Amino acid sequence: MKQLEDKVEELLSKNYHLENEVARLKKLLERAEERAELSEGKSAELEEELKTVTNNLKSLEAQAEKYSQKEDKYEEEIKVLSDKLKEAETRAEFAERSVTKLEKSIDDLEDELYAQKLKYKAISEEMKQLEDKVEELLSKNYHLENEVARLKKL
Amino acid sequence: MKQLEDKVEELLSKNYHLENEVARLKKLLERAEERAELSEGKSAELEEELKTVTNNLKSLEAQAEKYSQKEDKYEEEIKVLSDKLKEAETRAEFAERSVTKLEKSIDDLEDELYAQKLKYKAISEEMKQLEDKVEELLSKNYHLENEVARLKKL
Structure with a gap:
């Protein structure tokens, strides 16, 4: 029994x-659970951040869509103004040369009329x-x- | 002793x-550690995704900036061309109205010369x-x- 007493x-x-x-396993278990909790929590916040950023992105993609379009609009606008400007500067250039010519024509007609009038005055x-x-x-x-008649009466 | 029996x-x-x-907790621990690893892996993958979408958003913002300034550029060009067109149109119109005036004056001078030639013909x-x-x-x-001379000498 001295052996049995030693068994106890x-x-x-x-x-x-x-x-x-058991106590050690429980502490390690709690550490694993807290690790998982912190990470699951981070994923959740990151998930939210992803939706926010993704939304903001689909918007700039759309804005860029309107940006490109206006670009082609402005381009077409400028084109038209340039062609208008050219045409007007041409009309101006040529009309001015016509003025000079027409004025010379008037000078010639006036010279002719003056001479005609000079001729009329002389005739x-x-x-x-x-x-x-x-x-x-x-x-x-x-x-x-009367003198011929008078002489005949003498 | 019966006593020791019961104690044992x-x-x-x-x-x-x-x-x-102990056997049960080792099993729960094994599973909680796997869960943490998996969750930590997901967080790292989400973090990398957010970095990528963020770099894209930042890229779209830069682009959106170039469009905004290049837009004011097109705006400036249009105003410049517009002012020049107004100036050109005004000068064109002025010269063209002058031409019309000069042509009308030429026609009036031709009318007068014709009338003046008829006067000269009449006179x-x-x-x-x-x-x-x-x-x-x-x-x-x-x-x-002669008759007076003749009569006077009779």
Whole structure:
């Protein structure tokens, strides 16, 4: 029995050991659980961050869609203004050259009209001298006729 | 002793449940450690995803910035072209209206020259009739003067 009494002394110790092992396993278990909890929590916050960023992205993609379009609009707008500008500068350039030419034409017509008028004035003056001559002769003949009659009565 | 018997029996039963608890906890620990690993792996994968989507968003923002300034560029070009077009159109219109004015003046000058030539023709015609009248009266005058001379010497 002195051997059996020593057995009880062992089971007590070996049980003391099992107890310590149980406590150790429980501490490690809790550490694993807390690790998993911290990570699952981080994933959740990251999940949220991914949706937020992804949304913001699908928006810039869309904005970029409107940006590219306006670009082609502006391009078409500029094109039209350029072609209008060219056409107007051409109309201007040519019309101005026409003005100079037309003014010279007017100078020539005026020179011609002036000369024509000078000619008219001169023939008019000639007419007046001829009229004065007719008047002068009608008078001379009226009196010569009376003189011819007077002489016949002498 | 019967007493020791019972003591041993108690410790063995206790020892039994303890061995089973250690075996059970090792199993739960194995599973909790696997869970943590898996969760930590997911977090790392999500973190890398967020970094990538973030780098893309930042890239789209840079682009969006170039569009905004290049947009103000196109805007500036249009205003520049617009002001020039207004200036060109005004000068074009001015020169073209001048041309219309000068053409109308040329037409009026042609009308006057035509009318002036008809006047010259009309006066030249009277002139012809006047010269004929003078020739006739000079004739009559000539014969009358001769008749007076003749009568005076009888």
